[PDB]
Design a protein around this ligand. Structure first.
Ligand code: HEM
Ligand SMILES: [K+]
Length: 294
């Protein structure tokens, strides 16, 4: 079928103030529900939700992507690749109830932006305008990446999302957040010692830890360190490939550079497939609760 064009349409009469309010609601709940996942909080799962709802995009026909907010439909909601994301969706339920006017796509993506910023990460400019699309526009399962692959697979996989080497290495740095859960993906363990703090620890660990290729309780191979950290085969491929390695070293040695590059790649990821009219509002940069004294 001919590729569709998805034009961003601002929720009727809404402006920066309105979205900052939604951001605040999300941030406030992130602070309140701090016991989730052994006190890691919902930050990490919200970031993964934003990425998986956007990561289904295919640059070839513009199917998938964050625009439609199709994760709300069972086919995508039940994608094996999305196991565990139901927690993020349930967290956003009360937020959507309070602000019913925001589209699902805008909420899913904004949830990721809010989480990164509240966890001390870089500011991520965000644009509104995603519009809910019918259940038949839901992309089939299988568009998200496997974790038992190598550098070549990763590089090729991300080309479908129009991401180059630097963009891929920066985006993978999101693994500085949260952990793998055996019951969700067949992998177990955190990548870092501070799962709810967005920093460049992912890269430093990859380079400085002594990794051992072991098999977890699900009979899958993953790299483990005596410090209690782990890396998926796809994470470890970043130091096996010489081109990826150079970039990992760059980020491990420049926190600001990683922040700037992640911010750009993450916004790009969340905006793939969306056409923003020339007269659309400029991207919003939300203040954190801390900056607002809230
Ligand atoms: C080759 C690409 C990638 C693969 C194979 C991959 C794989 C995985 C796996 C297996 C998990 C564990 C899920 C669980 O058991 O709960 C996970 C978690 C996560 N991923 Fe990735 N991922 C990739 C890229 C990314 C990117 C690009 C982002 C975002 C920019 C990201 C953000 C996250 C976050 C924040 C978590 C933690 C979720 C939580 O703690 O609940 N991932 N990923
Ligand atoms: K971290």
């Amino acid at each position: 079928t001919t590729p569709l064009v998805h034009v961003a349409s601002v929720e009727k009469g809404r402006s920066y103030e309105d979205f900052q309010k939604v951001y605040n609601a999300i941030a406030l709940k992130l602070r309140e529900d701090d016991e989730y996942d052994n006190y890691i909080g919902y930050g990490p799962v919200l970031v993964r939700l934003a990425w998986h709802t956007s990561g289904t995009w295919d640059k070839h026909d513009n199917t998938g992507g964050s625009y439609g907010g199709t994760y709300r439909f069972k086919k995508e909601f039940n994608d094996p690749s999305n196991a565990g994301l139901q927690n993020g969706f349930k967290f956003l339920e009360p937020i959507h109830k309070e602000f019913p006017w925001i589209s699902s796509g805008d909420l899913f993506s904004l949830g990721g932006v809010t989480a990164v910023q509240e966890m001390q990460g870089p500011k991520i400019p965000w644009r509104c305008g995603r519009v809910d699309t019918p259940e038949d526009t839901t992309p089939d399962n299988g568009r998200l990446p496997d974790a038992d692959k190598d550098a070549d697979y990763v590089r090729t996989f991300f080309q479908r999302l129009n991401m180059n080497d630097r963009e891929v290495v920066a985006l993978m740095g999101a693994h500085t957040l949260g952990k793998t859960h055996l019951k969700n993906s067949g992998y177990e363990g955190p990548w870092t010692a501070n799962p709810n703090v967005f920093d460049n620890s992912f890269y430093l660990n990859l380079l400085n830890e002594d990794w051992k290729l072991e098999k977890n309780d699900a009979n899958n191979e993953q790299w483990d360190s005596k410090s209690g950290y782990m890396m998926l085969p796809t994470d470890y491929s970043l130091i096996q490939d010489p081109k990826y390695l150079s970039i990992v070293k760059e980020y491990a040695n420049d926190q600001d550079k990683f922040f700037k590059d992640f911010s750009k790649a993450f916004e790009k990821l969340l905006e793939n497939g969306i056409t923003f009219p020339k007269d659309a509002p400029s991207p919003f940069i939300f203040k954190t609760l801390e900056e607002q004294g809230l």
